[PDB]
Amino acid sequence: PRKIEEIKDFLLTARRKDAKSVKIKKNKDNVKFKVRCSRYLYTLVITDKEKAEKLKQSLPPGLAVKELK
Amino acid sequence: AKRTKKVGIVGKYGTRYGASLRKMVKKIEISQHAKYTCSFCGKTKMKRRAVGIWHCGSCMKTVAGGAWTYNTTSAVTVKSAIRRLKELKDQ
Amino acid sequence: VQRLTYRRRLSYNTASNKTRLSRTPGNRIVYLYTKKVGKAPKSACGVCPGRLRGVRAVRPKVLMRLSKTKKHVSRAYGGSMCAKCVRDRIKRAFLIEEQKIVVKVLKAQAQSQK
Amino acid sequence: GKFMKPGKVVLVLAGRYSGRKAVIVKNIDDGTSDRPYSHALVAGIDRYPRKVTAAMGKKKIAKRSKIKSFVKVYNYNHLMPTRYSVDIPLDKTVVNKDVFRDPALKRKARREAKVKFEERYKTGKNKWFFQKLRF
RNA sequence: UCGGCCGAUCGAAAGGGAGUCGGGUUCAGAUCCCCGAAUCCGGAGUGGCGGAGAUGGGCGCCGCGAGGCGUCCAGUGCGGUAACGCGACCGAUCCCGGAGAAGCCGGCGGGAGCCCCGGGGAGAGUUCUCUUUUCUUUGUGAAGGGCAGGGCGCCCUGGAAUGGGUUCGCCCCGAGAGAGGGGCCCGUGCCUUGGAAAGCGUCGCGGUUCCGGCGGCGUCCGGUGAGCUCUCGCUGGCCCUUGAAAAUCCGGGGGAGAGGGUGUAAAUCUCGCGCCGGGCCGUACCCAUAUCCGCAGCAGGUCUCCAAGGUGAACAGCCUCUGGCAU
RNA sequence: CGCGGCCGGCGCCUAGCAGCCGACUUAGAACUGGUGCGGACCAGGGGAAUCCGACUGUUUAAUUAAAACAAAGCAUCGCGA
Ligand SMILES: [Mg+2]
Ligand SMILES: [Mg+2]
Ligand SMILES: [Mg+2]
Ligand SMILES: [Mg+2]
Ligand SMILES: [Mg+2]
Ligand SMILES: [Mg+2]
Ligand SMILES: [Mg+2]
Ligand SMILES: [Mg+2]
Ligand SMILES: [Mg+2]
Ligand SMILES: [Mg+2]
Ligand SMILES: [Mg+2]
Ligand SMILES: [Mg+2]
């Protein structure tokens, strides 16, 4: 697994051709966006919730947006 | 305190092998395990590695020497003789 | 307490059968079979006993998948010879060649007299 | 007396450029409270010109006569002085000590040493300086 | 033109030898099945995408400046005094070196697992009296990133007797101590992605004759040590004993060559990502007071790994817990 | 003035104190039991001599473990390919 640090790197990671799906896991303290690429599972950790909600609608279309809750 | 009167290093052999054989091996074992002053670096670190092989820990210089002493009295006279014959050979 | 079993069919405490204890997310202790401890290179001088610095110490076949930078040092003979004995070789090479110039000049001025 | 002077050929003993021949540009030998040791600004050659023969041709010879240079500030203990010297007129305003705080200037100084070395490598003078030390 | 493995071949399921772990699942198989996370080797001719190479100066001009045109010249990366560092970092035949690759024993130190102690939970046990009690249980794989911690016979400054530093022991120093500042290696420890979604403990609710069902809560904080067992490291001792080899992989030296005429460029790339493949054989179970040998369900024989509490010097003997059994 | 922080006029633990935490171990004393206390377990009988073999080691698997063999030490012999 790989941990994506800032928001921008996650966007073009999710826009890759080998990105199979993105999973959103809502914990008590953070929201994790996990995109399943060919080699690695890229996880982006968002501390707050407004940025997590903003990222939810900005995801590329045609990609599975499975919610883990 | 001085722990033994006369056996010294061969106290490890106990009562075994005979007094004269222990006395004979005593002076060899002392020179075998002694640390000599290295003639290359000047440090007292030249110690026996194997039989006939003497190695210095500091300059990592390995010398071929005697079995129990760093050099034998045989080889020392030989080196002096070879030097004398070499300076006689040339002029 | 929980007692452990080997996870392979090699049942002897040989050098290739070395294990370490690991706690799994299922809260149990298992053997993890470790890799052998790698060694850094020794200097090509063959004199000083320390191993080289700046080189990752791995098993020899792991070096095939390492990048070039991880296997050498940015210097002449880097990754093959230590820094100390490179400096000595640079000095030894230069001073002996300087001596060759001296002996060549010395015999050249010696042959001026018949 | 003191011999570490500008124009003197030194041998680099440590660093990336170990074993490279080089010329002293400016000796300090007193410290500047930033390098309290004795140091010297040095211009040297990273890549030596290749050997050229008669049966090579003009275009191949000019290709092989190219010199890649470097400029460094070296502690004296990492320099091996030689008896040789080259009177190459390096521009002091271009090759100076404060060239290491701006990469653009360091490129400019390293270019200056390159053109001066190459024209001196031509005409077949200071041949020992431009030969690679074999060690 | 170059080219000696100077000799076929066989020889180890305990030697060498790249790279798989966690959870679930069966009546019987799982590191092999399923789920999820990786990883090694090999291939890509028509070149898969990026990034690197690699894209800067000089002079004439135009242009208010900035910036545009022409010409010429470079450009097989860069930083650090150094140890060395950074994501790549052209290069053949040849040469050099390293790893593979090394005994036994001692004493220390680091780390883990286990044991022990003090609390916080959850569930049980006792309650004739006492016991804020006794018992059980109270996770985070590989592989990445970061940080501790350990080690260094690594570097720089400097020059030490009124010698000093220092170990359990030693031992170290003008061939550079002490001190100050750095660098490297290991990092199995901690945090983080993996990760809680899983697992477990409890309390419930539905049923699909036999649900990886659904749900609530929890999965916490500390302290100790000549403790035991693994492991890592340091430093010694012993030898008329000096404790494999080879596959395989790597680094360096050298520079034969190759690449382009200033182009949104070339040769090249041990850098990031992407694409395809990994065939053959073994794999159940016993491994022994009943699955083996001894004519047999034979008090014999048959190579190993793990290893709790009390007492105690103790892997002793005696009692107990987990697990097992029926003499 | 970043009831808190940068420098300083601002003072003598210098026979060292204050608080907190922590293992086991040793020595000494009192009291005490029907003198019993390494309470089970674990756990050398000792001395004076004589012979042989120096010792440690090995040996007749299935009647002999010995004084037998071996051993270091000592001595002799052959041999320059
Ligand atoms: Mg094997
Ligand atoms: Mg862990
Ligand atoms: Mg074979
Ligand atoms: Mg089974
Ligand atoms: Mg974890
Ligand atoms: Mg020091
Ligand atoms: Mg849960
Ligand atoms: Mg099986
Ligand atoms: Mg039987
Ligand atoms: Mg039979
Ligand atoms: Mg029976
Ligand atoms: Mg009975």
Ligand SMILES: [Mg+2]
């Ligand atoms: Mg019965």
Ligand SMILES: [Mg+2]
């Ligand atoms: Mg006897």
Ligand SMILES: [Mg+2]
């Ligand atoms: Mg006798």
Ligand SMILES: [Mg+2]
């Ligand atoms: Mg026998």
Ligand SMILES: [Mg+2]
């Ligand atoms: Mg018998």
Ligand SMILES: [Mg+2]
């Ligand atoms: Mg006799």
Ligand SMILES: [Zn+2]
């Ligand atoms: Zn020496």
Ligand SMILES: [Zn+2]
């Ligand atoms: Zn060396």
